[PDB]
């Protein structure tokens, strides 16, 4: 029983980062080295764990989080980072144990004139807690006067479209991200290497 990593990494559409997707990986055998040995990924960074030794490890569960962000935002998907993504969309904890995997998806996620399906949260009063997911669409109140759900001055829609467009520079191009979290608890281990 192999782990359905193919469902995740080769998924045909991806989620918006504000509504990032999470699949629970459990009760399976995980061959990680098919991912690590691959020349497919421009980012493959692990924390609290060595990427070489992944096939020798068992875990209680593995969570696979996936979404799409800008190229120059991939650096925010790491412990201790700040910015629009890390503060307002997807936050990793300081004691993160797992791997961050990303690759350029310009050929898939950009269209002529702009692909407007992928969204990010632009306005938020406070930072996200780690692994928090905010899918609210309340009009953001930037002043003292209440918005009453109506857009206007000091009353902005909190989500914005990336508008990916294939002539973008690399920092503005879409990248697909998969974040594997590993938790080791005082419970039976459902995910082991081969």
């Amino acid at each position: 029983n192999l782990c359905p990593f193919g469902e995740v990494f080769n998924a045909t559409r991806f989620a918006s980062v504000y509504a990032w997707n999470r699949k629970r990986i459990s009760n399976c055998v995980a061959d990680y080295s098919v991912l690590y040995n691959s020349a497919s990924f421009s980012t493959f960074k692990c924390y609290g764990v060595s990427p070489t030794k992944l096939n020798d490890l068992c875990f209680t569960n593995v969570y696979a989080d996936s979404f799409v962000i800008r190229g120059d935002e991939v650096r925010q998907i790491a412990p201790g980072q700040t910015g629009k993504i890390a503060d307002y969309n997807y936050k990793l904890p300081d004691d993160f144990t797992g791997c961050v995997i990303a690759w350029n998806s310009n050929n898939l996620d950009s269209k002529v004139g702009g692909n407007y399906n992928y969204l990010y949260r632009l306005f938020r009063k406070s930072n996200l807690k780690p692994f928090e997911r905010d899918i609210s669409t309340e009009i953001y109140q930037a002043g003292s006067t209440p918005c009453n759900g109506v857009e206007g001055f000091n009353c902005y829609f909190p989500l914005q479209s990336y508008g990916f467009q294939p002539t973008n520079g690399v920092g503005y191009q879409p990248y697909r991200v998969v974040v594997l979290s590993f938790e080791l608890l005082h419970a039976p281990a459902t995910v082991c290497g081969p």
Partner: antibody, heavy 117, light 109 residues
Framework: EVQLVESGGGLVQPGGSLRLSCAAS????????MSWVRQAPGKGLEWVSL???????YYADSVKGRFIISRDNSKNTLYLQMNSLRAEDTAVYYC???????????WGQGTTVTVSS | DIQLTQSPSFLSASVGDRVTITCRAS??????LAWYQQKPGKAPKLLIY???TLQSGVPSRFSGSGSGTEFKLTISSLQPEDFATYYC??????????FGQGTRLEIKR
Amino acid sequence: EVQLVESGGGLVQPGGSLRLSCAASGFTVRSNYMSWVRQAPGKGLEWVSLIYSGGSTYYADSVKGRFIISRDNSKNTLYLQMNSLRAEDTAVYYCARDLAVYGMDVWGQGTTVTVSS
Amino acid sequence: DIQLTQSPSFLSASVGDRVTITCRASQGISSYLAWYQQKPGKAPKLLIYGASTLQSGVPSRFSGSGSGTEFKLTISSLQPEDFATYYCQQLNNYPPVTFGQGTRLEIKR
């Protein structure tokens, strides 16, 4: 009603310190992106610093580690603490409410900083 | 680092003319562009955001166009109060050249 008023500029020697203030009205500084933009005499606009609603702060490399952006939520005021000043820091300094993809829509009148021996 | 270059640095026109100022990004930045007006001794004033969206209050004789690397600000019929310096700003990115070097609109004779 919606305005930004700045103060605190003046003459200082290199290596000295200055604290610029930026009192807002018409919006809440704690709920907005706020940035500082400066304009050396006879030149263009240079972005300097930025502070998020959530508290994150960013600085241009020309001032990295010398300037500190902060705010007072009760006074609805934005600050810029300027340390280890150099001659090239001479400029008119502006604070502005940053609306990101909607640009910077509210600017102050500017305060003048001169750094010289 | 993505850079903005504005050209020309100085441009002369007269009242009633159609004026077009150009700004280039060293790489494609979609519509993440803003335009500002500045008069001597005064703060910048926001004109257009999102490359083409007019800011509330700005007269309709101002229009912005372009997506990618070449952006244009057009004034349909120049007014005496329009003689100023115009600045280019890239949005959702704060590199050393967040603002272009500016184009000064001056009176022809």
